[PDB]
């Protein structure tokens, strides 16, 4: 898997929750949409590539926003990239979405799909506008907003890695569950509530958890994904968006194969995929 | 000279699905607030009686496909801890049950079914995955299983489709006389030998009649006192009348790139294996493949449209009932909401059907 250009599109508003699990992250406000940010965001990744959106073989869409999706607040599936494809005219693209996947997960999965069936350009999106779902007030845990775009020709050669969080090994971690809101008296009321419950070594946890995955491929520099404020600068963190400034600052050092570490909140792991860059 | 790769072989090992035990009659109570319900209706799509999971009766999304892939495990003396691989899918955004996994969890959103489901069986040592792509699933989860299979990143993977449709039905519209809920489960192994393989698939979208079917946040079409609003499959009529000739070409469309990377036409073809929208679609594609009505049946009758379970189902009637018999080779194919269009050339061996 090749990353030939990265998009990214965040709000510009964002709201600090407190809690072990707290931070002070991107949030989408009133109204907005996520086509609003994912639509510009692969914009500029094409044009980074110099790929027209005809060209697009395949896009693979990660989204757990219950609504908020596109010009119709209301809709939740098809899923985005659905829609995605029409307003972008990739006339010539298959569409499927992975759901609650890691994007390290998705584009080693996808990467192998791809590959075999001899596709060229790939477009992997991540994005959320996360006002259908209630944040958890008693932890201080929020999915960051935005919208995230991978432009990659895949290689079939991409190694997966899924590996244990650290901290105690004998702990049992209590995953992130998103139950339905069971009296919905509005179509504006939140459609789910985050459920992550307040544990204070998670953050740490998950950061070991992702040198201990490093360790597999010693000789690759790697990014990563924080989706918890603690101990970050500013108690601000991007969730997977942070990916982005890290993957331009790896391009702008000339650096040719990197690795890319994922925290999946729904299995409590982190999963790894090996990837190649193009220079920028 | 040097010598080329070779990908392995993907054998459809056995296949099993598991349906709702009630079934409900075109006439059934549950139709009561329906409008615009004649006889017509009924004989034109097809469908004479559904099923739907009793959640009260323990039947769900989760519960069914235990039963199902422990059945099929067993049956198929596969170990847990020998499945490399899970895939699933399921069209309704809204699961209900976790098992003994996360037993306090009751409707959810996420997380999804993989992850889940590889802990209550004990698959130990499956990448679990959530893929969608609504009454095509089935045949994604076919093909990312069988690239797994082919580079040599799998040796085992266990598919499932689980579609509890009837929770996003509005009963006071037409629009939930056609769907159904059902269960399927298949295996997917490296071949020993030449007996079985995928041939070759073709998979493209068309996102221009998006807004047609649709998954939203709405209320009744036709409420009664306070309702409440809920995740409904909802309809633009004015929409699908225009895409009159879109669904029947484009999955004929999928069958002929399919066939042409297998090196195939239709006249090699032994069965042809189609989702189960309408009686008239599945004749119109068949009929845009040159394929004969002995070469095909149609389910929907006693089952309903159950999205991704209708190939899936179609599959294990014809090998059940001896219309698919070992070393034919068939095309499976089929439309879905989005859109999206997916056909698949098999070479089959000896099927476990369980």
Redesign the interface.
């Known amino acids: 898997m090749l990353i030939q250009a990265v998009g990214v599109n965040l709000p510009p508003s964002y709201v600090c929750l407190e809690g072990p699990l707290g931070g002070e992250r991107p949030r989408a406000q009133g109204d907005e949409m996520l086509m609003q940010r994912l639509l510009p965001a692969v914009r500029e990744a094409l044009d980074e590539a110099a790929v027209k959106p005809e060209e697009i073989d395949l896009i693979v869409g990660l989204a757990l926003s219950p609504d908020h999706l596109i010009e119709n607040r209301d809709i939740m599936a098809p899923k985005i990239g659905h829609p995605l494809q029409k307003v972008l005219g990739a006339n010539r693209a298959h569409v499927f979405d992975l759901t609650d996947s890691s994007l390290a997960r998705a584009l080693y999965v996808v990467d192998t799909l791809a590959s075999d069936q001899g596709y060229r350009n790939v477009l992997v999106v991540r994005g959320e506008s996360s006002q259908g779902l209630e944040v958890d007030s008693e932890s201080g845990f929020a999915l960051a907003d935005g919208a995230l775009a991978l432009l990659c020709r895949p290689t079939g050669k991409a190694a997966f890695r899924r590996g244990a969080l650290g901290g105690d090994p004998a702990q049992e971690w209590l995953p992130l569950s998103i139950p339905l809101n069971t009296d919905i008296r509005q179509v504006g009321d939140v459609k789910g509530h985050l459920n992550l419950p307040a544990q204070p070594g998670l953050p740490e946890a998950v950061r070991a958890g992702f040198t201990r995955l490093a360790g597999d491929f010693p000789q690759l520099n790697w990014v990563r994904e924080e989706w918890f404020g603690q101990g970050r600068p500013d108690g601000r963190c991007l969730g997977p968006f942070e990916l982005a400034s890290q993957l331009r600052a790896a391009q702008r050092d000339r650096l040719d194969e990197l690795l890319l570490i994922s925290f999946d909140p729904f299995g409590m792991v982190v999963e790894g995929v090996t990837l190649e860059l193009a220079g920028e | 000279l040097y010598f080329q790769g070779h990908?392995h072989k993907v054998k459809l090992a056995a296949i099993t699905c598991e349906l709702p035990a009630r079934s409900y009659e075109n006439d059934d109570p549950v139709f009561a607030a329906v409008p615009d319900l004649s006889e017509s209706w009924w004989q034109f799509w097809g469908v004479n009686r559904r099923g739907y999971f009793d959640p009260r009766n323990g039947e769900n999304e989760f519960s069914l496909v235990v039963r199902a892939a422990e059945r099929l495990l067993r049956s198929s003396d596969t170990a847990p801890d020998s499945v490399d691989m899970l895939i699933c899918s399921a069209?309704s955004?809204?699961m209900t049950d976790a098992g003994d996994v996360?037993p306090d969890?009751?409707?959810?959103?996420?997380?999804?079914m993989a992850?889940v489901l590889s802990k209550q069986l004990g698959l130990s040592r499956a990448?679990?995955?959530?893929?969608?792509?609504?009454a095509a699933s089935f045949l994604?989860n076919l093909?990312?299983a069988?690239?797994?299979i082919?580079?040599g990143?799998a040796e085992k993977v266990l598919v499932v489709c689980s579609e509890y449709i009837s929770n996003l039905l509005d009963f006071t519209s037409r629009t939930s006389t056609l769907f159904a809920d059902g269960c399927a489960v298949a295996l997917l192994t490296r071949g020993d030998d030449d007996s079985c393989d995928l041939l070759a698939?073709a998979?493209?979208?068309?996102?221009?009649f998006?807004?047609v079917?649709?998954?939203?946040?709405?209320?009744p079409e036709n409420p009664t006192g306070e309702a409440?609003?809920?995740?409904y499959f909802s309809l633009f009529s004015d929409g699908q009348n225009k895409m009159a000739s879109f669904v029947p070409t484009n999955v004929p469309i999928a069958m002929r790139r399919a066939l042409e990377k297998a090196g195939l036409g239709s006249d090699d073809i032994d069965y042809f294996v189609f989702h189960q929208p309408a009686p008239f679609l599945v004749k119109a594609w068949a009929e845009g493949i040159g394929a004969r009505p002995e070469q095909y049946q149609l389910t929907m009758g006693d089952t309903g449209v159950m999205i991704s379970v209708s190939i899936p189902y179609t599959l294990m009637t014809g090998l059940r009932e001896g219309k698919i018999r070992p070393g034919d080779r068939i095309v499976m194919a089929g439309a879905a909401?989005?859109?999206?269009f997916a056909a698949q050339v098999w070479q089959l061996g000896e099927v476990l059907v369980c």
């Open positions: 990908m069209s955004p809204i996360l969890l009751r409707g959810r959103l996420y997380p999804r992850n990448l679990p995955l959530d893929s969608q792509m609504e994604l093909r990312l069988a690239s797994m082919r580079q990143k698939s998979e493209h979208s068309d996102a221009t998006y807004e079917a649709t998954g939203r946040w709405r209320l409440k609003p809920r995740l909401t989005g859109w999206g």
